Symmetry: D2
Subunit: 494 residues, 4 copies
């Protein structure tokens, strides 16, 4: 069932959120937020800069002080607040999905059924962990009692991307808050709006002031202020590998703050001759085209064994030809726009390289419409490994399909990238499934599926696709700081 908002959406929250109150920018400057489907301005939002990041950090630091409400409340109560926040997001599901669709260029059906479902479920998952973060008692050598505390790290700067604004906001704040940290969030300049609504709900839920502070603004200004701040303990970032390198560099230069990155990919699929063919076609298809290709896990290199290659390419192309482009709020529409001009240009440029470097254009390959940043869904076959479309993350609706005959070699080709976020293996053979997935240098390996993400699983990159993991049990480690306490005693006993 797909319900809708009965009256039109009004924008209410447009200010900087610090100590549970709404702040004008220090400068007094504001910046426009656009609908990528119409290119029309939706509203103006307060432009956070370094001076506003400073206010946000001071508030987060104060909320983190020993003896504060957030440090002293029961872990179970941190849990409770997070589950309350999930209930509120569920209450505002229609509003949030519509705002997400409108600001983010994201299909409403997907926004409502997937993004918001995952956002609520992931919050509820994280809430459950709050009072289950535990240290150890350790049988050290000598006459000592040794225990560890898995403390919160402290003030965590969190830079959110534009492709999944609500989901990524919750991936960040959910674990960070469950573990007892305070946060300074910088949502994407393209998509500040849903985060600012969430801030209103954080206040409503009863989080102590200063526990969550949200500072909208640009990357090079507010994002740089976060990455180079001398009193931010950790920075978490999702986005391009380029900006990832600037984050990690600036942390080293400033205060050696902890860094976790989720960056791009050039994720491969290997489709064996014995695979369920239309399952492999359908998952590889959705693997690359989901949300206009604007997924870090985009299945952007599909290697198919020679004897099934032609049939795979054909079936893929007919699937790509079924889309309806338009406003992502209109029902029946199955593909929205790209997020902005910068991305739009980058995609069309890379589409042209495929043409010039000699890939076989099967369909698409140009723009669409009078307004909006729309790219026709594009499929290239006979792609080769030194092509630009095979090396660079497109972040657009552009599928690459390659052939292989040797399994040894295709694994090398799959692994021959600086990326390593994810990969897909399609086969019916037990041994192939286990051995190939083990050999791929990818953080998530899907077998006979693609793009299956859930709160219970850790998620992140090998190589230049990232540092660290988010979600699962394992992801919660990176929002704690471990303290060993070693107490002299007269005599220990086992």
């Amino acid at each position: 069932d797909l319900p809708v908002l009965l009256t039109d959406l009004k924008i209410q929250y447009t200010k900087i959120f610090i100590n549970n109150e709404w702040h004008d920018s220090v400068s007094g400057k504001k910046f426009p937020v656009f609908n990528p489907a119409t290119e029309e301005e939706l509203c103006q939002v307060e432009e956070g800069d370094k001076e506003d990041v400073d206010k946000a950090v001071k508030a987060a630091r104060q909320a983190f002080q020993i003896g504060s409400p957030w440090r002293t409340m029961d872990a179970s109560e941190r849990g409770r607040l997070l589950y309350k926040l999930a209930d509120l997001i569920e209450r505002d599901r229609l509003l949030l999905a519509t705002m997400e669709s409108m600001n983010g260029g994201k299909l409403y059906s997907n926004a409502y059924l997937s993004d918001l479902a995952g956002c609520i479920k992931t919050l509820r998952y994280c809430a459950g962990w709050a009072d289950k973060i535990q240290g150890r008692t350790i049988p050290i050598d000598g006459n000592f009692f040794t225990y560890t505390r898995h403390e919160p790290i402290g003030v965590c700067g969190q830079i959110i991307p534009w492709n999944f604004p609500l989901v990524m906001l919750i991936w960040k704040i959910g674990p960070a808050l469950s573990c007892g940290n305070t946060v300074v969030v910088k949502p994407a300049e393209q998509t500040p709006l849903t985060a600012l609504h969430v801030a209103s709900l954080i206040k409503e839920a009863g989080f102590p002031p200063g526990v969550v502070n949200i500072v909208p603004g640009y990357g090079p200004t507010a994002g740089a202020a976060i990455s180079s701040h001398m009193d931010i303990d950790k920075v978490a970032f999702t986005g391009s590998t380029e900006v990832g390198k600037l984050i990690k560099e600036a942390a080293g230069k400033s205060n050696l703050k902890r860094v976790t990155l989720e960056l791009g990919g050039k994720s491969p699929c290997i489709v064996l001759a014995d695979a369920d063919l239309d399952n492999a076609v359908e998952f590889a298809h959705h693997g690359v085209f989901y949300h206009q290709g604007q997924c870090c896990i985009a299945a952007s290199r599909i290697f198919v064994e020679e004897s099934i290659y032609d049939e795979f390419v054909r079936r893929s192309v007919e699937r790509a030809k079924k889309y309806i482009l338009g406003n992502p709020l209109t029902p029946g529409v199955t593909q929205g726009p790209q997020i902005d001009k910068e991305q739009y240009d980058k995609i069309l440029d890379l589409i042209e390289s495929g043409k010039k470097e000699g890939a076989k254009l099967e369909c698409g390959g140009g723009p669409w419409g009078n307004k909006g940043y729309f790219v026709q869904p594009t499929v290239f076959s006979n792609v080769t490994d030194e092509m630009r479309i095979a090396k660079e993350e497109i972040f657009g609706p552009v599928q690459q399909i390659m052939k292989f005959k040797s399994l040894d070699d295709v694994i090398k080709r799959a692994n021959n990238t600086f990326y390593g976020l994810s990969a897909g293996v399609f086969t019916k053979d037990i041994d192939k499934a286990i051995t190939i997935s083990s050999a791929l240098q990818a953080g998530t390996v899907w077998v006979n599926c693609y793009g299956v993400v859930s709160a219970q699983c850790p998620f992140g990159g090998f190589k230049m696709s990232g540092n660290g993991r988010e979600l699962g049990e394992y992801g919660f480690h990176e929002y704690t700081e471990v303290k060993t306490v070693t107490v002299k005693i007269s005599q220990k006993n086992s």
Copy 2:
């Protein structure tokens, strides 16, 4: 490579081992130990009874007292002693394998290459855990510091079976000692000898006195004294399901001591039409015939899909016809005797039921030789589920082969037993492998193999095949007792 002992084996250790010294029995009675291959007496061993179990428990209790060397030594040093003991067993590998072969009716090749390899490796595995047993620090509600201690339980009574005397001795003492317990071991009346050599090595390694006490004797006398003792904290037993019920009952009646049991099985294999056929034949074959069928995991019901049933039965029968019976010390011999008269009779009785109830005898089905408890390797095809050979653990070289056509039904037939130790699934299909192994009510499920046991894996039964698990991380839990310590504090912080 298979080296041998250059001079003949002499028996040295035949006494009760308490506080690292050798004790005559309280009564002064001794009991004979036999070679099952010749039916000839090997030696006399001191007969432990209730009165000697009492001395052993008092010594174990004293070695466990707060402030004792065993309670106060570094965990890492418990580890060190265990790795030292492994080195000593490796030094005496030839001696121990020969004694194991001679007393246990066990093929020397297997004794030397498998039993002793596994015994050494499992000890070394357990040694590694000693200083890695850890409790927790817990974010309890209220202003409290809460931690847990994973303490040793205390005095652990450990009753060892005759089928794998050295291996099972080490499965018991390795984890128990790693965790800091003291032990009173009662090796099988049939096979006391290798345990008594190990005791000599425990002394040599430098274990504090009273940490390991070994009391040979009979089950109904010494084993009952252990199970009903008022100062034994835990009993661990491997053997028949019948005796398992008496152990668990007597613990309840006496002092509610902790109980873990590894009992029999009637373990099924399901062989799908798509399986690698000779791999399935070879593993199912070794699955049921290993060590004269005297394995709790014996693959004693092999269900084979109809279309490959005849070929499976044929190939199986030709494999069963390749054996050479005789003294397990002679090279080239590939099948030794059964352990004793009691077992020998039980097997022949059950072979006769198969005949009378209408199973198709494919080969074997009677005794062998002038001396020794030898049973011809026996294969029955067209076995049905209400036959005695399909319901009762034979513990002999007797294979049952059934047919099936429906996967739903064969899973019900596989699960339709009070047993549940293990099972085998043979297929090339990923989905079948995962779904079938999930649906089987068996503690270990092997896929495209059988009888793969290693120290890193937990091992134990569903249903009446046992309570608890041994080895792996998980098995170490059952040799600890958890204490929660909750300290009032003025103010907690996360």
Copy 3:
């Protein structure tokens, strides 16, 4: 704040609960439920016997079948149902606390503020674990992929005591359901009513039918049917050590079902001369007198260093003299009745032994009132270790206070019992706190407090005070059954 029910309580649910529907007993027999404060009958409830336990188990078995809604739903959804059930109990907090107070003889203030708070919080804690129960992937020797599944065990029989009916119901069903088990609950014959209301709420929450079945009735009839059933996989019991031995025995006799017991105690406190004296008095006081002494953890032996003994005894006695006896529903009342005749008699009998064996009666020592099972709060000083009041669990408002001068000896006296549920240590000295708590043979050791119980902590007995642990991470282990799956592969890699 202490709100109350605005109209009088009516009893609605009095039937056996199986497959989410209300059943008359097979026999058609009913049994009375009494108010212990008035000795007046509250209602009649359907008397479950063996024949009704059988219906309940068959339903639980069907709800557990592979492919059923409960086996196939997401773990996260098991979590969701449990948090929903907590919300419903919170909605019915007034009703449930009043019914709990009225049926259980339990002070309303305590019922509302403590029992119901803990019940809701513990459910919410358990809900959080549902999708965080995980197995392992294990680096086994050889070319194999090995993983473990921490499966639900299956049908769990759960026998609930009368002292904390709602709390203990939730301690049982919360973990059992979180882990995926189905349950057959037998609440206490004295206190069936609040469990039957909870059943109505389980239906309301949307649990699949057969996942929770509640069968009220007597112990020797319905409780024995559970303990000896051939298709119940596990039994969990809280109550007397006497009945605990019968449970464990019958499990051994029937189907070797898994057993966990939380039994009585004779829990000691050691109060050092340097202790905060009135903190030690107040906690030791509440430690023994809470809920009319009807706590398994009753601090029923208080050892106080000689130099502070007289002052401790005096201060204790003046605290014991402050109580107001009466109907536990009336405000200002600070002590309700004992649960029934059987318990009432047992307490008065033991009070008389203290007198006859020569303890110094400081106050109390007889009955109270015209109606109700009231015992005056009783304090004995100069108690010695062979007295009946020092050895036997009274389960009544009867405090024992002893003296000691040697720390070595008082620890031996503390540990010189077959019990071992809990203990208390009162001192300002770091080393004493750590060394004493380590040396006590007690499952929970409180330091400078007593009776601090929370969902995040494991809880259970050493020795004859129990087998296994409930709650915490550690307690969830005993509601799983571990399966090892070992898959043959061509080549493994680390």
Copy 4:
């Protein structure tokens, strides 16, 4: 007992170690290694540069390839090799301690009894973990089987400091190898020699070639080549905070390699009025003066409550006056030299600042001897927080003693530093011990002791004292890379 080497030490291993063979440098250049006690050259060692780091990385990459001996061997066998290496280091204990003493300026007694003991024990600890590194099976939403692999990361660059060359070498390679990584080690330019002997032993133990490669040389040349290499997956570094920032920056600039740092400290002790005074004096003394102050954990700010300050300062000063300076190989000598000119100058410079800024010089404060880099043991009292000696890591035998009267304020002063490696709390009060240790922003907090380090504990910095943890269970996480494998299945069951 302190045995010694019976003949004089000869230096044998002086070459670059790659693929288990000894390599001359690509350039052919060599660099001198000095004895800091005599300032005399001990030998020449091959100077590794970028070109030699490249050979080492290519070899490590090849040893890490899927299907290689190191990737395919049993985890238990990785364990075995590590325990074998420990046995070899134990065999060469005299040789290694003497070489360590001679090259490192380290007291022989300490080298033999502490450094080598810890090195052997830590290796044995790490060996135990090898086959106990496990992933998870995870109850993901939807019809999927999800598991994780805790894989080795790959090629790990490891830069070792000069203060504890053998110990730090083993802290690095032990966990890295246990987890299955290959390593390129760059020992300190001052202290290459003991690492090169260890390399000879790695070959002897039977490690596959390319698993450990050791490249001696300078920091700015070989260390920079490691930190900026495009095919090194992780860098681990121990040393100054200054160089730590350059490492973390260069990783960000090159290939976003994983980074863990153990950096300097300015570690505080808080000594309460109720503390055991001479225990606090003795531990705080050894806390700052151990190994000529060249410990990252140096207790370099000792805050003492006013009423015990004078007595503490006095007692401290008399302890500092007991030392005998000289060659660290001569028996009875209790203080050796500083490591080199650079460090020597830095210490004397900072000693002068204490004088000029107005600290009270209690003893020491200048150089010692005709040869060697000796600094007199120096004590400053009445130190204040803006003094250079209170802010900067001296890394020399220079003690700072401060006074405080307010506990709130002294905690702020303790925490008012960019450092945060460790701290010490001295008190008899339970509550103070727990609350203060919780409030300190330090990775290890010792209570009534100092400098207690063991393999079972995680160790590392808060703030600019480091990123990540070494040793313990927790430290092993940072030598794994987590892969999630999610397999589509027809139907899951719990």
